[PDB]
Structure formats: C-alpha cells, structure tokens
Amino acid sequence: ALDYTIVVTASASQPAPLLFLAPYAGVAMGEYFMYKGKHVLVVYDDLSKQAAAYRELSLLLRRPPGREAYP
Amino acid sequence: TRGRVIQVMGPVVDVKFENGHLPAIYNALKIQHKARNENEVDIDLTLEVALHLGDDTVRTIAMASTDGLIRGMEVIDTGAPISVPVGEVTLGRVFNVLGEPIDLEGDIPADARRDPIHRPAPKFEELATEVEILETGIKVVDLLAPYIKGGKIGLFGGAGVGKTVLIQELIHNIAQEHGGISVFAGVGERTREGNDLYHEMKDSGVISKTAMVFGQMNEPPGARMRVALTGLTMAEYFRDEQGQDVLLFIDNIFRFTQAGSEVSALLGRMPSAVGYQPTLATEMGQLQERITSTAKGSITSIQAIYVPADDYTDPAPATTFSHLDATTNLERKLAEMGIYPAVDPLASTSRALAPEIVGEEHYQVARKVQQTLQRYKELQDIIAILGMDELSDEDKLVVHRARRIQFFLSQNFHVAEQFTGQPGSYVPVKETVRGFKEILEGKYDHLPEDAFRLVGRIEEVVEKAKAMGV
Amino acid sequence: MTRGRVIQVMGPVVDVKFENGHLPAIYNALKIQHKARNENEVDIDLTLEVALHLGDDTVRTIAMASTDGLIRGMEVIDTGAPISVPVGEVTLGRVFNVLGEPIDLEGDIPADARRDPIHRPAPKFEELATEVEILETGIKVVDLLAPYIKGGKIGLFGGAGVGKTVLIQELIHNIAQEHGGISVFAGVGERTREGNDLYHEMKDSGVISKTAMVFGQMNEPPGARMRVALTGLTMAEYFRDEQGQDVLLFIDNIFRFTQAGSEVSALLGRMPSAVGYQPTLATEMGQLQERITSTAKGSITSIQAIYVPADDYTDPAPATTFSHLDATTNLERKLAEMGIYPAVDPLASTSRALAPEIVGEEHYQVARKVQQTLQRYKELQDIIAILGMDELSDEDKLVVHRARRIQFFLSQNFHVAEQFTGQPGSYVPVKETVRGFKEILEGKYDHLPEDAFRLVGRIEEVVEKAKAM
Amino acid sequence: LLDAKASEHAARMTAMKNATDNANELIRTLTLSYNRARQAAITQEITEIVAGANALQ
C-alpha cells in the first residue's frame, strides 16, 4: 500500500501543537491532489486526541475553559 | 474616524479608535488591506462590533478568518450594521452572510436597497390579535399538526426521510396558493447538504421563489451567528412591504446558539449553565420575536432542530422549545413503508389543534385519528410476534381502519412529478377533514389497503381503486 | 474614631472602609442609620455582619436586610461587639428576629436589659458532662423506643399533616411542667404564614408563656437566615448557664441553615465544594451544634427538622447533620390516619441512647421486645391479606393479638389536645411506661379490648377505659 | 390434574413475587448509583463553571 499512500505521524512524545496541526497538515497534503483532479482518502486516527491536545494548547495559553475544560 | 487593530485572539479582534469617534454596537467595520511586501497577506474582512471597552478600544467579531492580521492595520468604520440587499433582486440568488452572492450569476449593484440586519421586534399593538392557520396542503400537517400563520415549527429529521422534499413542497404550495416567498437560511449545517438542496431547488424549479443564505460549518462563528438574521432581514422585506405570508427555513437554530457560545467565551464573558453563553435567551428571543405575524403580513418559520444526543434538557433545545408552536417529526420507518411525507402522526404535535382554533369537526376527526393510530401502535408487538389471525374483532377493525388511515395521510407531491410522473395535489383542510371522517366512519373499508397510498383527495381513492380492482 | 464609610454595594455584600488601626473584628455588627437629608435620598436602618478583611483598611460585610438605598460614602457605626441579643426573663413569650428585636406588637425591650454576644466559642472540654443522662419527655413512644439525651440532637422526619407541631407543643409543655425548663423555638427560613400559624397555635395552647420564638423567615437576606439558629441558641444558653436548667431548642428545617450558609458563601466569592456546598459546611454546622451540649450546670437539648433533599441520606447537607444526631423520631402518615396520636413510627425511630449502659437493662429488654413484636406483626400483614385472619397458627395469632395492643397503647392523650378532645392529658414517667409495656408483653392485660388502649396515659388507667366499655 | 393446576398457579404466583422483589432490590441499588452519579454530576458542573469564571479574573 505504500506506493499510493502518505503517512503523517504525530507521536505522544511530540508536543501538543504537533498533535494539534497534524490533521490540518494531512488535509493540506490531500488538497494538493484534490485540486489537481485526483481522488484522496484522509484518515484521522483518533480525533479525540486532537481535541485533548487543543485543550492543553488553549489552557496553557490562558484561554477560558468551557464544558469539560475544552475551549 | 480611523481605527487600528490591537488584539487578534482567534475570532475576536480589538480595534482602537480616536476619541469621540467610536462606532456604536453592531456596526460593520471593514479591513481592506493590500500587502506592502512579500511578508504580508492581502486581507478583506468585515468586523461586527460586539462590546465597548474602556480606553477607546472596541471588541469586534470577525465574519471570516483572522489569519494574516497585523497589529496596526487601519480599520474602516462604515457607520451602520451589515447592510443586506433586499427586494426582488434576492429571489433565486444564493448569498453570503454579508449579503454578497456566492453563486456566479453576478453582482448586485450598489444603488439597490439594503436594509440593516439588527432591528427591534415588532411591538405589542403591531401584532395580530387572532390565531390564523397557515394552510399548507399537506394532509399530516393540515390534519394532525396545523401550522400557525406566523408561528415557529420544528422539523426533527435526519436523512432518508425526505426532509428536502418536504421543504420543497412547503415552498411550492405556499408560493402557489398564498403567493408567499420563502427564504432558506442554512445556519452551520453540512455544505454537502446545502449543495444538494440548492441543486434540488434548481431541479424542482421552485428556486425562483426562494432566496438562499448559507453560512456553513466552515465559516467562523460570527458568520454562523449572523446568517439566521440576514435570512430574516431578507424575509422581513416581503412581509413589511409586499404583505406576503413568508416562509423562513432555518436549518438548525441550535447552531445559532452554539456559535454564540463559541463567540462569548472569547468575548470575555463568564460562562453559564451548560457552558452556553449567559445571553442565551435574549439572543434567541431577538432572533425569534422578529418571526411574528403583524397586521398586514406574516412570517411563519419551519426550523430544523438537531437535539445533541437526543437530550431535550440541554439549555439550547430548552430555550428554543420555549418559542416553538408545533413539531413535525419525520420518521424513517414511515419512509420505509412508502408513506411520503414521512411525518410521524403521533409524535408531531401543535398548539393549533384545539377546537377554538381549528374548528370543532376538525378537532374530533384529528383526535379520533390520533386515538386509532395510537391503538394500532400499541398492537405492534402483538401483530409482529403473536400473529394477525388471533387478536379479536373490534381490534382487527382498529388495525383495519388504521392501515387505511396511515396510508391516506401520504400525498403525491408537486415536486415528485419529475420522479414519479403523477402531477401532484394541493388538498384543502375541509376536504381532508371530510376524507378522514369518511375513513373513520367505515365508508371505505371495502377498498384495499392500496389506493390510499399517494392520493390527494378522498374521491381519488375510489378513482384509483376502480382503476385497479373493484 | 470608629465611624465608617461605604465603598461597594452589590446585593447583600457591602464593603465598608474604616480608618487604619480602627478596624472592626470579624463577626461584629455595624449599624447604618441614615435620615434622608433631601428628596433624593432614602431613610435607612440596616445592620451588617463583618465577614472578611480585604486590605486597604476595608471590610467586606454581609447584610441583614435589603440594601436598597445605600449610597457610596455614607456613614457606618461600629458597635464594638457582635449582634447583641436580649436574654433573660424578658424574652419569654415574645417573637424575635435575628437582630434580637421584637417582631410582635406587644412592646420594645428597654436598653438596660442584658444582651450577650451572638458568636461564642463552644463550651470547653473541662465544662461538659461526663455521664449521659436521659431526658424524660412523658411521651411513651419517645421515652420507650427512641429515648432522648440531655444535650442531644433529635431529628424529625415528619413533614406536614402528621402533627409535628403537636409534638413540639407537648415537649414544651412537659419539660416546662416537670423539669422547669424553658423552651426556645427558632424557625430558620420557614414560611411566614406557617410561622404565624405556629404562633397562634402556641398562643391557643398556652404553651407560649414559657417559650421564646425567633423567626428569620424566608423573605430575609441569607445573612439573616444563617444567623437565626444562633440567636435562638443564645437565648437558650442564658437558661443553661445563668439559670442552670434543662432547655429545649427547636430548629425547624436546619437544611435552610445549611443552604443559607451556602448562598452566603456563594455571595462572598468562595470556591464551592462537593454538591454545591460551602467549603465550610462541616465547621459551620459544628459551630452551631457544639454549643448544644450538656454542661455541669444545665443542658440544651435540641429537636431539629431535617429536609432530606432529593431524599438521599448521602447528600452532604443531611450527612453533616446526621453525624451530630443522637436520635431520630420519624413521623408517619399512616399512623395518623389510623388514629394513633402521636404519629411516631415505632420501627424507624432509632436512638443512640437506647442501650443498657445508658438507659438500663429492663427498659432495653422491654423496648427490644416491643420492636420484635411490631416487626413480626408488620411482616404478618401480607399473610393476613392473602390467607385471612384465621388459620395462621396459635403463636402468630397471639403475636397479632399482642402487637395490636402494643401498637394502640403507644398513643397518648396530650395536654395540647385538651382544647380539641376535652381529655385532660397525662405525663407518663419512664418507669411506669416500661412497667406497662412489660405487663402487656407478659399477657396480663390481654383480655381487655383494644380500644381501651387507644389515647390512654398509663397502664393503671386502661382498666377504667375497659371498665367503661 | 386439579392438584397440578393449583400448584401451577401457585408456582407462577411465587415466581412473579420473587421476580418483583428482585426487581425492587435492583431498583434500590440503582437509586444508590443514581444518587452518587447525581452528586458527582452537580459537583463536576459547578467546578467547571467556577473554573471558567476564575479564568477571566
């Protein structure tokens, strides 16, 4: 499968902004092929970890919490 | 006159003006910026003023993304809120939140009449003293959950239930029999479904009656906040000048509240009960008290609602159930039976169905139809498990009349002519009351359980049954 | 000089600034008296209780009445002491508010009367009572099944319609008859029409000439309702300390005390703890209920209605009261509709005192045998329902024929009900009610009809009601 | 057979009494769980509201 797929990784050892920007980097890589006429499938494995990374990302930037302390 | 940017934190933008020249609340502020070098990005924003702070600064809300903003860009004060084009110009067009056409049909010229978005609700003496009934031509709606001319309706449906087909036949029947323009205001719901709905507007041919406003999930919560209000100020032109009985479709008023909850935490407000903004009920009321029937006009409103996790005690469905007058509940099982529109006859309710409003005969016929369909609902497991040949008589009669009733509630729409071929029907309320009275009395128990499927009137039942069989 | 000046007013919370070094201590009282000098201003008489110190020579207070009209800059007078409440013989028969002022239209208390502070430390470890003495109420179902302690806390779980106020009036009557003990009522946050109904019932009863009442009712600010049980209790403490006698102290719905402190703490800006309760829940309840003790000179015993919010005993407001309770007396509606007065449920009313070391051996054996026979008779109800009265056995038929005599014998003729049924009513000592239930359980009074046992005082006068029928 | 029908109806009587008592004690333990979850829900919501208020001050 690795002659037609790209893998974007954002590990747990990587800081919270790299888990925050991982789906946007994946869908930018998808948009490059989409606006050329190709067909892209993008799989975001565990978006709830993106939500917790952005929750950390906001709470450390002194943004006010909301429900379950998400922004 | 001229103000510069101080803070950019996500959606919100703080702008400092010169002393004595502050803009009032809800004005539109514009940023037209051209990049002076290769280290900058061209910017076209519209900023809605939300708060006044102390030292000549103003906290605004962005209508688009704030990516690219530099602390120190000059901001143009327009001196008015977001002026939105109104008229017969807007019919058949698709708009932004700012009143700009997002379709490629053309630009609206600058000398056209533009109305501001924010205006007070109509007063106490300007409203209509009596309750009048918005006659739709749809038999589930006309019989079992009538629509107030000027009231607020709830559609509770997902996909596969033909919600777009029901929306289209509402627009078609109102613009056919009442001469009423409709307006679809899609507030933060699924750009794919918005495009499906626009191409079905184009195919149905009823689009030339509606005006469409889309601010979807992709847009910042200022745009999702103000889309319902710009669709509302497009409908209020037709009410306030043409006197018409205007429809107004808001797709998920829930999004009107949660976009405000996204905004208000950034505005600096203390959080409320469910994490929702403190100003939940007054913002929802300033939306849904402009949707009223005045003396010369009307705006009725059919409003889709996605209750999150089907939890009706959440503060935003509570605050918007405080304003509803009816519910139209689309079910998937009735769509699998073939019953179009798939309105659940027992769960869909209305404030109208009381004998002082709809009349006395209509009230007895609707309550007897509800009682026999409830009794057939109570026999669902018995028929499905134990069998049909074992119940009793005076209950086999109940399910016998209940099948003919729950198929006669379906219609052939004018919109489905391009898909089925039969030319559709508009059914008055007195004729469907007479038809359901005749089916309840037992006049049509010798006809089959087909020929009640997809017919308008009650004589079309026998005109179809003589074509099939006896 | 101790003259103050208002800075902030926001609801009940009022910030007052004094000069440096002339600050009021915490819990002091602040008299605001203002005569309006023009048509703009409004006349004000208003007392504040100091709660915090904010720095910058300021003081944050909570208000006892409405703060409407308070102007930034107006004069505040420091009393030099907390809220001084009149005590003595001049409080008997009089309805009072939290400030020690008479609600009644009878008159004013003169200024030379003794007034003692509202906030007092609890009586020390040196001064308490070593032993546990019994409190003899003269009610049989109380003195046999859920006995009281001098210095105790007792819970009423009745509600309306079961005769809670009838027990209140009879406990006042019996203690002031036999023990010479003044009672004090304190309605912490109760309906005003029910306060007036309670006052007219105790006036018609005649019990009032011996009690004292405090009503800080629901219309008053939370700073009043948090301090109302303290000013009933300060009236009780005079007769405990100076007079040396066994005093009652009724706190109606102490859940109103807990949530009054909760909303005071929410106004003061504190972070709320578990279940929305003020962080200081257990220590405010402790500062109330550790002054209700039995010292060497007298005692204060307390009977406290408890709300039981969303009817679970694990909510912190029932849970921090139940750690001070020494007894409970459940009032049940089906015993009042049956005809048993008082409506005390004999199986749900429990007591920490009901033990052979505290009470005695014979009382304990008779009381536990009464609970066993009533438990067996409560088990036999479905058997009587489905099998009928006959053909059970000889033994359980004797159990039913014994236990209905015990169940109807638990009702008394109160002295309170004399103006309603004409029967003079009786004080039954604890030795004679133990002897009476012992002689019923032996079977000595088994042949008498069961309607002789209803509404009768002791066992020597059930023979005469059986003789009259 | 009359003996067996009487014992049939008595056995179904006792079986449904035991099922009702089992359901009632299940209701009791579920209300203990409901009160625990109710208190925990209210304290969660109140600390999140107060934390969102303290974030601004």
TrEMBL record, chain A:
It is found in: Cell membrane; Membrane. Coiled coil: none annotated. It comes from the Bacteria. Mg(2+) 2 binds at residue 45. Signal peptide: none annotated. Produces ATP from ADP in the presence of a proton gradient across the membrane. The alpha chain is a regulatory subunit. Belongs to the ATPase alpha/beta chains family. This is ATP synthase subunit alpha. The gene is uncA.
From TrEMBL, chain B:
Mg(2+) 1 binds at residue 164. ADP binds at residues 160-165, 340. Residues 149-334 form the AAA+ ATPase domain. GO terms for cellular component: plasma membrane; proton-transporting ATP synthase complex. One of its GO terms (molecular function) is proton-transporting ATP synthase activity, rotational mechanism. Its EC number is 7.1.2.2. It is found in: Cell membrane. ATP binds at residues 157-164, 351. It is a peripheral membrane protein. It catalyses: 4 Na(+)(in) + ATP + H2O = 4 Na(+)(out) + ADP + phosphate + H(+); ATP + H2O + 4 H(+)(in) = ADP + phosphate + 5 H(+)(out). It is an enzyme of class 7 (translocase). Its main location: membrane. Gene3D superfamilies: 2.40.10.170, Bovine Mitochondrial F1-atpase, Atp Synthase Beta Chain, Chain D, domain 3, P-loop containing nucleotide triphosphate hydrolases. Produces ATP from ADP in the presence of a proton gradient across the membrane. The catalytic sites are hosted primarily by the beta subunits. Produces ATP from ADP in the presence of a sodium ion gradient across the membrane. The beta chain is the catalytic subunit. Belongs to the ATPase alpha/beta chains family. This is ATP synthase subunit beta.
From TrEMBL, chain C:
ADP binds at residues 161-166, 341. SMART domains: AAA. It comes from the Bacteria. One of its GO terms (cellular component) is proton-transporting ATP synthase complex. Residues 150-335 form the AAA+ ATPase domain. Mg(2+) 2 binds at residues 165, 194. Mg(2+) 1 binds at residue 165. It catalyses: 4 Na(+)(in) + ATP + H2O = 4 Na(+)(out) + ADP + phosphate + H(+); ATP + H2O + 4 H(+)(in) = ADP + phosphate + 5 H(+)(out). InterPro entries: AAA+_ATPase, ATP-synt_VA_C, ATP_synth_F1_bsu, ATPase_a/bsu_AS, ATPase_alpha/beta_chains, ATPase_F1/V1/A1_a/bsu_N, ATPase_F1/V1/A1_a/bsu_N_sf, ATPase_F1/V1/A1_a/bsu_nucl-bd. ATP binds at residues 158-165, 352. The keyword Plastid does not apply. One of its GO terms (molecular function) is proton-transporting ATP synthase activity, rotational mechanism. It holds the Pfam family ATP-synt_ab_N. Its EC number is 7.1.2.2. Its main location: membrane. Belongs to the ATPase alpha/beta chains family. Produces ATP from ADP in the presence of a proton gradient across the membrane. The catalytic sites are hosted primarily by the beta subunits. Produces ATP from ADP in the presence of a sodium ion gradient across the membrane. The beta chain is the catalytic subunit. This is ATP synthase subunit beta. It comes from Bacillus sp. (strain PS3).
TrEMBL record, chain D:
It is found in: Cell membrane. It comes from the Bacteria. F-type ATPases have 2 components, CF(1) - the catalytic core - and CF(0) - the membrane proton channel. CF(1) has five subunits: alpha(3), beta(3), gamma(1), delta(1), epsilon(1). CF(0) has three main subunits: a, b and c. Produces ATP from ADP in the presence of a proton gradient across the membrane. The gamma chain is believed to be important in regulating ATPase activity and the flow of protons through the CF(0) complex. Belongs to the ATPase gamma chain family. This is ATP synthase gamma chain. It comes from Bacillus sp. (strain PS3).
